[PDB]
User: What shape does this take?
Amino acid sequence: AEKNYVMAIDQGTTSSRAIIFDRNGKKIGSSQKEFPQYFPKSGWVEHNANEIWNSVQSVIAGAFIESGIRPEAIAGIGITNQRETTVVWDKTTGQPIANAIVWQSRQSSPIADQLKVDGHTEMIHEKTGLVIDAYFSATKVRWLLDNIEGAQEKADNGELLFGTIDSWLVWKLTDGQVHVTDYSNASRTMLYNIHKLEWDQEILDLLNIPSSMLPEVKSNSEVYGHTRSYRFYGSEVPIAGMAGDQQAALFGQMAFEKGMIKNTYGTGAFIVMNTGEEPQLSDNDLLTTIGYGINGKVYYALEGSIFVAGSAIQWLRDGLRMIETSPQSEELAAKAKGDNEVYVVPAFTGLGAPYWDSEARGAVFGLTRGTTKEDFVRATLQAVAYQSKDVIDTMKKDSGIDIPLLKVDGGAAKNDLLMQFQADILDIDVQRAANLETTALGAAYLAGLAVGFWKDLDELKSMAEEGQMFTPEMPAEERDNLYEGWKQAVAATQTFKFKAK
Amino acid sequence: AEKNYVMAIDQGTTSSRAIIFDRNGKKIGSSQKEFPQYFPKSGWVEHNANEIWNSVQSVIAGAFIESGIRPEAIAGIGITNQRETTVVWDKTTGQPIANAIVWQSRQSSPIADQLKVDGHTEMIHEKTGLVIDAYFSATKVRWLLDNIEGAQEKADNGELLFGTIDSWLVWKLTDGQVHVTDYSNASRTMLYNIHKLEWDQEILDLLNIPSSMLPEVKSNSEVYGHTRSYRFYGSEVPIAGMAGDQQAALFGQMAFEKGMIKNTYGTGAFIVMNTGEEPQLSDNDLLTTIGYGINGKVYYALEGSIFVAGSAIQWLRDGLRMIETSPQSEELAAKAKGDNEVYVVPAFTGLGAPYWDSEARGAVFGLTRGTTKEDFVRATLQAVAYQSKDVIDTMKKDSGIDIPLLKVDGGAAKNDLLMQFQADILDIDVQRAANLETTALGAAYLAGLAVGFWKDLDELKSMAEEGQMFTPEMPAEERDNLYEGWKQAVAATQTFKFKAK
Assistant: This one.
């Protein structure tokens, strides 16, 4: 009955993963599994919430199998997830009313556009810290209530429940007894007032979304409940940590103080800076969101979202069929002999921060007869490094402070050439985490703190390990020219706004 | 809780699988997973027994996840397995002393040859119904005790245990509380007397194998014990059915009466005929083994083993890299345009029944400038149909009876073209099971009968499923020419016995 381990579940965009950690933060067992991605229409991205649940069941079992640990030895469970993605389900049957709409989907953009034409931009920003876009949960719920036959009526009759992925997983783990979400995930819905810390009745009324659908909002570190005995191999394990994946990574990077910033390279790339208990500054071209709430306090953050990063490589593999495997991209890019003047702006679903141009589409520039597959792949990889600079330069201007160090993590961070390029273009040190899955580590820490597995933040910091440090080694003239080309490439991309009439 | 399902675990040569069945015998959930194959020296084949256990834990979990059924709803578990494969482990640590030696391995052939030169053939055949060969467990255990430093002494002191895969799995499921095996698996060890129904001391003494290593032998349908709640996802479930995979298939085909025969096409192909409560003395060139023990009686069988069947296709994929995937073989074979005079005799590790020539190796004949990849693949696939005829003709000769019908199952039986060819060459009806995994079905039936899930054999017959029937449609002339060529090819293969030095 000795509880010597904590489990973290990371439900991502294209795969789910579960990891069991010991008191020292060491990985004892891990498992990962992909699940189906659906693209019913150009720009639309959907997931089957039941398939997501099955992938989570699979990796939880997989982690126990690799570790050889008994479920009764788990002290607590932490859950982290792809944010914004929306699920609406029937409370009695627990069956989703349709596929979940992924954060990547643009299917609800017409609703978002209408909200802007009505002049609600400043209003929404004041309350939520966000920009009006189909990226967030709000318009996705509206889309579901508009397009799923009889859904609005069911919702008005209090038969339907809304939830981002964290809420959906806890509902499953507690078999319908707990319907909750944490501050971080709630702030990404565009339905939550991040200053008053409550669901915004004004926005809810505006979008005709009943309150009966909404989960209780709680902190990121506390016992929300426990797994049903039959939901965790006979044990009732405490579910005590919850956070959106990018915020969990911030916590896992131990970015607990104002100014601390990180970038996670995954399906998309997300730069997040801790701004403390007071979001006292300008957040122009960025997002003001809740980093995490612990010990009765709420810590805000500034964020810059780059929608397409790893998915650009997936496109080279599945769309153009240019590369056989995603990891192969690194091999090909390292062999590029071009002048490095080719630019790929993979804005498949619009440009993210600091642009926020939903009308822009993917583009390529500087192509010559000598451009090779290697050059094309290299340009595609470099795009995330360039836009990360666009975001960091914006943060520096908004915060007014200086950023001498960037902590990084995520799958793509494994590419040494790319991380070196990132440091080179930014002209600041880039410190990679000892273990790329800092997202899961962050969730584990939140749960661990809630159940006393770890006594306080200081004990966490004592587990810190030093990861590979990448220092700039590129002249000012070169990096200036490289970045200038990128700026002009994005500008040209933004001029192409063809709309068939 | 209410028990409305039965689970079957089939631990095969290259993969493991778990299937959950309902009262009507319908599949509610299934899962399969491959595990590592090790080839240390040419002719040697080994498995890591812990990796096999992990593959089983994986598919058990996968079957529950796909089915949506809870372990508390399982009435009983049936276990079936690759036969002969040997594991020797430390009773205390539970750790295997080395990799398990697979039935395919020839590493113990020097030990088997030495037994023949010493003239023990008649003695062994009379006691076990088998032939002296590295195929069976006996020489594998001796190999382990000869080559694993300190193993013999630990065995003499009773610290080591021996077990075929079924025994190892039950040992793992009961966390070392039960060390048992069934009649069918014990009969394949070449250490068990199938007439007296007990381990044979004379053979044990001959091979210097301590009786302290041996498991208790029980029937194929009875509760051997219950799972430990932490070894079967939270529940203590009866383990009530156990049988070698080929015998489990025989039971699943419902070949309960004397004369009923079947062939299972998988990694290898095995023809098994039920001989009733009487072991057939006229078994020249074949094997007399135990089919299964149930209702207080023991039913024997006559067997013909074709070692290389599906593994020949695996060879075309991984060895010659002639085909991209195993299923691609059928598509290629269907396109062959040659006159079908190319013969492939895939005796990689020697010829099985009715030849039993351990010195023969793989060979090909009838090649011409016009022979294509398609022709080569078709010839490879046809080899199993030809040797199956060699086996069936031997059974007819030994039993002195006709065989009008042959029931077939197995993953490879899915090839309509191959099954029709089988029927054409044999000139008899070939009835394929509606459910190719009759092996798992047989295991589920044995376990079901043991826990009263099904009351009797007549109830099993009631849920019988009708499969595709294949009738001969090839003229005697073509039929005889095709087969005559095969006989001449095998004869030529047996003349090549080159031994360096």
